[PDB]
């Protein structure tokens, strides 16, 4: 019961059973991501007001509001461990990411009410941002579980003012609205003034009984005195349900406790507009031919080791098939339709390993996978260009080391096919996806899908083996300091500063601290992400194409039959 | 459990019980009425193949295939009438209007299979622009039950070519797409190029196992030799199932039979996205305090008489309840938030009767109902723009002779206010409906909410009292013939000819036939097409704004108590 | 001094120096030509009040006020003949098309204030939305000389009322507004009701010293001795300049007189954006190659004659340069790059001649030329998609006969390629024109760029070796007949009439009396157009693609050295 199965179903399929499993390569894997659990754990765990705590006082923490709201196996939290600010706790105070809720897949922000009530900390409105971006490129549900106390006073010059401050999501979700895309909102406990404004901005407004909203909240011996005396006369916090269900009614529901809160947005998420998948799909829904758990042989934690990539690909989509667009032309990529829980969805990654009389514009050259030339910048654009008027989303496999470089490259036009490129992703107008396998480096970063095309970038994930670099440290090194060495060993040891630094500043976990890759997932989660993705993009889409209709399957095909 | 009671419930509530009740009026009224019922009977029966043949030949008509789809009682019909080339049987071909769908409301084009195998009419084309163009408008599924033989041979001239002709909805069905609005079609009996096209332009392909699409199909001595010869070796038609399902896959589902087919089309609506409409609601629904049959009494068919406008929208919205927008301000015209089904709606209605001390640019005037002055310009001007930042869609009461004239109307800036309101609509960027209670005349007519505003009227009906017109005959027969009378029994009889042509071609069917009005509509079915439409509305819409972040009622409560 | 002379300097030259000229075919076409003219003449020159009669009044006829307003040399009229509800004089009462004022591109509009005081008259309203969208489309600045005496009273029926009739255009301005593309108005004479309006929906009001704009004007013993009391009290029109300047100041400017209402006109138009052209331009703008006069020879009046496309683009771009895009696949078309005035414009044109060996999907078969087959609709369906990414505007040169047919076609996909060619058209939003060279018929003539876009093509014009019809009268007959033979004289009858009627409502002055096609230009004007429509195009566009961004130039370089 799909269109055209003569170009969905029974695509090539790709990928080998794993023969030579690489036990220490696996383990190295896993190391960085113990680490990044562990660090999660700790992160999540740290605050004054512990779990326990909290719930003896009648709350629940922001995991287990989180947990409580979506289906079992459906959590990808993103920006985890972001904390571009050093915050001494290891977050930007809030929890965020995406889950499914009755089957629909929503955007969640959780106040971490464990941490100073809540509080707007340094890092947490760009956290805020990189939410409601990833909602509005997906026109996806944003759901705020709003603990919120605020602007942290002793930080309040970097987090109360600017363009990217307190204030933007609020305008953001005025955006979100006005674009069809609404935002519920559970309030409890204390929201005032920045918590006030998190609380009214969304759509939907549900709250418990003993929580509050306001302009302004109820916040030396004569201070002492003064808060004694206030504090006997029981004068309510301004804006408790008695004023806002009572009077204002802008509480549109009041429930009794935290889980009945959660019900009342899963009722308004019931409501909510999503197509059932099965519209969009072009097969039924089925799990690649070969495991997962074989990633951690095949992508190399040595940086000089190349590998397959079609073994990544068939390990990441439906049924390992594949149909590729222009197989031979820009040998540096691949480029090709897939299919995620039967969903059409445009992959673009690069090749690795070296590629025999290749560039065409060398003479008796060799071409480096992880580079891009002439022809893969070329098939690059022709087949984002296409995706884009077929309304089919992009993934994009990175594992790159820039595009050629020197004066044979710039007369094959390098530089004005990667500006091309970008162009023609800006253009897409397409929710995308970003996985960073291996390297993320040079201008390739940019062209291949980044995260610096803030229109169609939702947001980004690496594995394990990622690492985030302008260039090699050494190469770096040479560049700057080759010249000083020359005119003129304290140049020497910056050199060698620079190197180290560079292998620091480039390790997995330091790289979404930074917010460079927004979450490191697992080796076994890079699946879940594509399909919490994709199925996240044909939910509320807002262009269509008809399969029949459809440019890249035909374009794909003459290429194959025509030369 | 709704946001702002306190403005939104228990709002005024107006309207009498009707105290002298006017059989003969009732009597009137119900006589358009019934000639309208028949004439639609009539034109639906009409055609070579009867609903018998049909049947017999294992085919449903238009009305059977359109009644297995839908929910009982939820058929409103448009254009039943339309017919502005005179087409013999009345009708331009295909039936069309909104219809829900196990509780989603969807918009309906159905071939009449009955007449010429369901070919390209005169003014078929144009009937169906005005179907995409509501989808469109209102972001709602468009759904073909198509049975399509083409371009009417001997009419080839006024079907096939030209902007508005045959070829258009193809472009029309693309923008849809593009619009993510979805196109679901089932594909019945033999539908060759220009029916061909209208079974690929959709985004589902639904077919009937005895159904073809195609761009050519299988259409003196050696003419009946070839015939017969071709029949003999029972060649299929072009585009047959073992084609468009078994090779190219371009029919997603094929059906045994008719109602098969509906069943399909069904299952593909289920899966489309769309509001449970509570969560717009902003009250539960309530019936009218007041009967519709009422309005067979209130509104005269006798056009020199007056009545009371608040009972008619007292009859037609959500428990006889309406909160006015500046009561006192532009009498003439009343403007306000009302609830249809729980939804909130901006009503525009004109005041009938004589206005005593008004306008007041003038000296000791009396205001005539019916007419537009300033307050009243200025008043629409802002409750549109009100509306429009809300979200909240608007319904338009037509019953007017015109904006004031003369040069105190100039002076008090009348012709650039009409044209004020016509850049308030455009900018207002919503859907709305247009409702003729009695008369639409001059541009008053265009300037509220007129169906000439091709971007929000999403199309308009009107009573049995409606009547269309430029202006009175008599007055037109003056306008025409007053100065040709004093430069000169020729010219009498000319201005005699014209006041009885203004009437026969104001009379709600000729209207209706030319459409000027969409359908003719009886007085028990007005709140019915309200609530298709404003559920239609509320189902899908592009844009939201909270309730709580709302600016109509607010400065509706504003000029109640500052002053 | 312009981008990339590599790609877009020195590209192939096509066409040859006409060898056989052929006086019989130039002969022929100059009798279209004549008889063209002959009746745009006589329709200009017809109604009551005369050229002379106008001047000796104060008042410049709609010519005169074109001439007057715009560049020597530079009238490019559209819809002259258009009256599809045949009205007496042959025209919609409005006068049309493209003009250039001191180097800028205009849209404009001029009232025939001959005929009935400028009245509206059925057809009309069509007339004036074909004006609104070509200026929407363009983004181009609408221009009205207004002299407007509203709706023609004994017509009102079919210029007052409906969705596009006299109101429309009102919307139409607001939304031209609201795109930011201005109109300017000038206003002669008197302009009441639909006059006033179409005087005060415009942007800039500049206005007559004697003329007026009115909601509403001054418009059988006692009706004569009304007239000629009030016509004794020197009441003055309604809404004159002492009002609507010195009152309202809705009037920006007055003028003496007609020129200077135009001088006025010409200082608003100097105050508008536009682009110095060069800013868009690939190279010097140069004439053709070779001259136009061949035109006349080359394009057979014998429409079963062939003939070489490239000898027609050869002589209608710039310098006889063309850059082919995948020259060799789908050779039924011609698409490629060619030049306008140095201007970059994508040529998409059907190639005529018998093609051995083709299509690929068939045994030992021959292609016609004027049909489309599977590679030539998906090369098309890939040009639109390049050169909408590149910002490149389409002229489509069509001559054709239709998609192929029969089973063998739909298993290549033919149907669903014909509808994603008009899904690549509508995804292009860019403005592009038509020319119909010889035939528009079948579905072809919608998916080549047809004017059944409404949100792309511009407009359309014709040469007169053009037809347009469904297809030919005799193929018609038969699939009208055929059958009916078989099951029964009286049938004979019928077909020779049918092909007869075809013949007759195909003819080049009935298709532009319809509007099937805008207007029938000369072939030494259809360059004039080209260059028109291009220079609109680039005068104010509202997305650019930098040239060294570009994929069409890219992709096309690719095709030739790869493959
Ligand atoms: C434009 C935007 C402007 C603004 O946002 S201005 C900020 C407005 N916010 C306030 O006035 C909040 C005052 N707080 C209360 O009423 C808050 O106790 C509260 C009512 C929530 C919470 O009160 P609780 O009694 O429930 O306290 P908790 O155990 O949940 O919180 C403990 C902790 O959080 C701290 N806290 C709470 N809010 C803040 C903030 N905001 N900054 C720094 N630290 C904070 C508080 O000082 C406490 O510190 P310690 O005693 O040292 O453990
Ligand atoms: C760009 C667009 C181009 C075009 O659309 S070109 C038109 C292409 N259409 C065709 O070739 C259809 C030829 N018809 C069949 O095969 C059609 O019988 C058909 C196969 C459907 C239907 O065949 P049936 O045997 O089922 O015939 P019906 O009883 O359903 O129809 C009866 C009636 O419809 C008439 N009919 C069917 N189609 C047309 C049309 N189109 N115009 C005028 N009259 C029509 C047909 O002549 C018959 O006339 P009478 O014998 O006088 O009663
Ligand atoms: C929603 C929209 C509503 C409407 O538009 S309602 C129409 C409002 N228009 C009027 O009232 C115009 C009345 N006319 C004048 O004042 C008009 O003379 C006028 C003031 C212009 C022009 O007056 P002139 O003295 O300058 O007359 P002209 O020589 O320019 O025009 C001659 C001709 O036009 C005719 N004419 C002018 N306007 C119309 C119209 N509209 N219909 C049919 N015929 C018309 C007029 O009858 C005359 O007919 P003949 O005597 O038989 O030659
Ligand atoms: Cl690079
Ligand atoms: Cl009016
Ligand atoms: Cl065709």
Known sequence: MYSMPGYFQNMPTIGKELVNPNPENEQEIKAVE??????????????????????????????????????????????????????????TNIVNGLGRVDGKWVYIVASDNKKMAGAWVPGQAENLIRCSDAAKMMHLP??????????????????????????????????????????IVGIYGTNPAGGGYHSISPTILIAHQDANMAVGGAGAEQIIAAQIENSKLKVPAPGSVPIHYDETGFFREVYQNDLGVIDGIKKYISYLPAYNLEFFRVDTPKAPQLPAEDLYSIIPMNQKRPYDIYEVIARLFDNSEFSEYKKGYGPEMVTGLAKVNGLLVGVIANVQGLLMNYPEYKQNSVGIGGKLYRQGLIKMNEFVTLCARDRIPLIWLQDTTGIDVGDEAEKAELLGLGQS???????????????TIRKASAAAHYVLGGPQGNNTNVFSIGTGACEYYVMPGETAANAMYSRKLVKAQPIIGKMNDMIQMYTDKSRPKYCTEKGMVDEIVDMTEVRPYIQAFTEAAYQNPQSICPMHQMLTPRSTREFETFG
Request: some cysteine; glycine content about 8%.
């Open 34 to 91: 113990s680490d990044i659990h562990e660090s999660i754990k700790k992160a999540l765990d740290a605050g004054i007001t512990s779990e326990e705590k909290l719930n003896e006082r009648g709350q629940l923490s922001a995991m287990q509001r989180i947990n409580a709201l979506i289906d079992p196996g459906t959590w990808c939290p993103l920006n985890s461990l972001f904390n571009p600010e050093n915050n001494k706790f290891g977050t």
């Open 142 to 183: 944003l759901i705020y579980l709003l603990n919120c106390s605020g602007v942290e006073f002793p930080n309040q010059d970097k987090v109360y003012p600017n363009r990217r401050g307190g204030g933007t999501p609020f305008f953001r979700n005025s955006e979100l609205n006005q674009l069809g895309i609404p935002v």
């Open 421 to 435: 490129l970008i162009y023609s992703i800006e253009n897409s107008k397409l929710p995308s996806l970003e996985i």
